[model samples]
Target: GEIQWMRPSKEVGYPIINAPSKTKLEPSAFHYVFEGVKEPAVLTKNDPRLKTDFEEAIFSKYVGNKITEVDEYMKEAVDHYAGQLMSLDINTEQMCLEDAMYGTDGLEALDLSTSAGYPYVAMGKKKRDILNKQTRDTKEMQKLLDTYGINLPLVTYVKDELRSKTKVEQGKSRLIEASSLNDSVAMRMAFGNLYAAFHKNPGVITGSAVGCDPDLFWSKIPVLMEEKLFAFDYTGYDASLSPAWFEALKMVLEKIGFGDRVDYIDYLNHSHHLYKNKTYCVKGGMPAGCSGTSIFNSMINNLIIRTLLLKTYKGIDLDHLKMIAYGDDVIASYPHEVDASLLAQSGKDYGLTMTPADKSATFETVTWENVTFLKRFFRADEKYPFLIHPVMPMKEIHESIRWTKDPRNTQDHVRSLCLLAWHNGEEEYNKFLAKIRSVPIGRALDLPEYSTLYDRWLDSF
Candidate 1:
């Protein structure tokens, strides 16, 4: 079937363009598709609304005495675990450093975009500073590795060989693979296999941490040597780093013989931003923009759970428990009925609070009520007792279509649509196609041969 391409109204003033014979459409072609649509309004830094929003968000979220208690609890937990891991011949300090360093390398290799938060200057300037520091830290880490004679794999970006072999096709097909000890897919598959092994309904509990980052005790970090990576010649509200955490972090680094390489950790935690013509130093929690935040949070949370499972609940069989965590969010399945209160207490013991009751759930089999995990709805099939079927949530499908209406997010929106098609089957894909056709711009032009596009996207995956 021929792919239909559509042109936008000439009054929209975007450059005239022709559709490609292939199913894949370029960003420029998408612009033509929505030429007359009004762009969304973006608030400038100087806008009063921006200031009010920032103040309200920061004050309501971060300004609280409870954080102090949480931070203190976290410090003790870290010390206990650090001691325990050492006795077991596990070098947790080195593992965390490597995980953090690899995160920075992956970010640089992929050239990904980060959120706007601490160090809230222009994104372009902050990004450049981050890249420069990343390059320097890479060399510093290599130096430490050489001195210690340790072997570590470097993360690098590579083109998707199956799709983009030619130079002209590189833009769309460029993908990256990070060489890390942990594989998300492997973890998911392991969880699935464990779930399949259960003969009867498995009690499932899913919960997320409340303000995971803010709860981290800054004072527990072992080193506090700050680097002037960027010069901020302004003044505002600055949250000072607690020397206690710096000292704690330093002890671990010193024990691991990487005391001199504290710059990376320092960079990860310290950052400043300009708001209302004043500069404020962000305190507590890792910087929102740092790539290391994900790995660092995941490592800490996983260790907390592991310690609980092994040490706290010594009588429980490890084989019977199936738990998976992606950063602060966690879902676990058990062969027998497990009380949600026990899990809640486990989190409380570690200073990590469970997300409110509404966001979390405890269930013993699939039911009419929506039970979602990792963005997929869990359902049981009548004929398949051992296997479980996961389907895309209806809300997500509608959300993906809403995203497609925005010209600025063309690539991501289309990619998500393709993903839904792949996950939900042809009937779902047809429904999506029909919905797209009914939209204002979708009706104006011949839509791309999305079926062919769907095949290509599936192949890429």
Candidate 2:
């Protein structure tokens, strides 16, 4: 008896657990088919947020410390790691550490100093100045602040600092491109390299890197490219101004040429129209997506955790309580089980808090909840393939016979047939063909039997 007009079978039986579904695969699994086509076996933690055990320890030692010592370590790190990196071959010269690229660790290293703003700033001949020549128009600002209901405490803006900059207008928003504000690749590499080395050698520093999430930081910065601000005292801030701190700060500022060119840009959002025409002291902290942000961020993170731990637990060794920070994402293992309220109160001074307890927690298999990020502990056991899903989405499988309809590019087309045989098994391919007579398309490719074509193409392929 002739088979009823041939149609693909709709195989339905007892519900099978983890059975892949074709319909479900269309939208969800389709993307994975491309995303997981291939991935590098050697994982390089791109954001430090994805750091593993070793990486965390190293980054802390490099980023943590008094201002001067941090730069001391920074310079040595640059000298050591610059030669090791193979710069991406995107037609750019390989990078090396240069003092001109990064200022000296002494007072000059302060971000407030205009003299030290090398690779990151393009300054014209003007001295960097942070103070408002005229007393701040607090009354004017207060009226505006009251009008807008911006509940900030004495927040201020510098009109002179606001200058010209680019902002690509998106549909309903402005995308402030911060690439122009980012620090040098050299500085990033130096810090990143040092961090990597520590990562490679685990247990060197005795703490996990808990990332940071904070509201502010700026130490008398004369000019800025972005917003947000918090203040911290540099305990060993060896400057010459009045005490060791201020004098070192001014001299350092001169070397960087930062104070000379103090300019900022104006911004207008739906709820706010912030327009200014003269330089102003920005209470704002480091700008995101700018150069030197990483270093600045790392330093402050180290300062917060180290300072708090030292103040709270004076006798306890700090290596045990160090909180290594990656941007706002922070992780650390406490030497002694500590109370949450203590940390919350300490961080309050800096406007920081561990709101997402899950991300801030330390342990194996911990994920940074809400960060859309995760970190894992790996083993070489066969039971644990570095990556493989237990339940995979099913995709519809068509037999090789359907491929015979192609009348052009048969050789390339034939590869699909072989793939059909490979995926569904050769038996499935042959049996499906055995049930067919004329080609489904009612056309023929200029080739031999489909089976023969598949064999030849796959062999050559």
For each candidate, give its TM-score against the true structure.
0.47, 0.30
Tens digits of per-residue lDDT for model 2, 1-461: 00112111222111111211111111111122222221111112232222244223211211111222233322332222222122211112222333212332210121333322211222321212321224322343234324433211111111111111110011111111122112222232234333333233222131212221110111101121112111122211111001111222222222323223111111100011011111111122332322334333443444445545554555645434424334443444443555444655654443343343433343222222221111211122133233211111112223222222234544455444434333233455454333332343223333345456445433431
Off by over 4 Å in 1: 1-54, 63-263, 266-273, 281-283, 289-291, 307-322, 334-337, 356-371, 378-390, 403-412, 443-461
Cα lDDT for residue 159, candidate 1: 26
Candidate 1: 10-residue stretch with minimal lDDT: 228-237
Best by lDDT: 1
Per-residue lDDT tens digits of candidate 1, residues 1-461? 01012223233332222211222222333333221322212122232223234223232322211122224334444454445324433222222333333332112222324321221222223333333334534454344334433111112122212221222221222212122212221211222221121211112111122122211211111121111110001010011122233334444434434454544444333433232323334344333222334433433443445444544454555344444333454444444544445554554443344432224344233222343434554444334333334556544445334323346665566555555444455576666556555556555544445457445533432
**Model 2, runs deviating above 4 Å:** 1-281, 290-292, 359-461
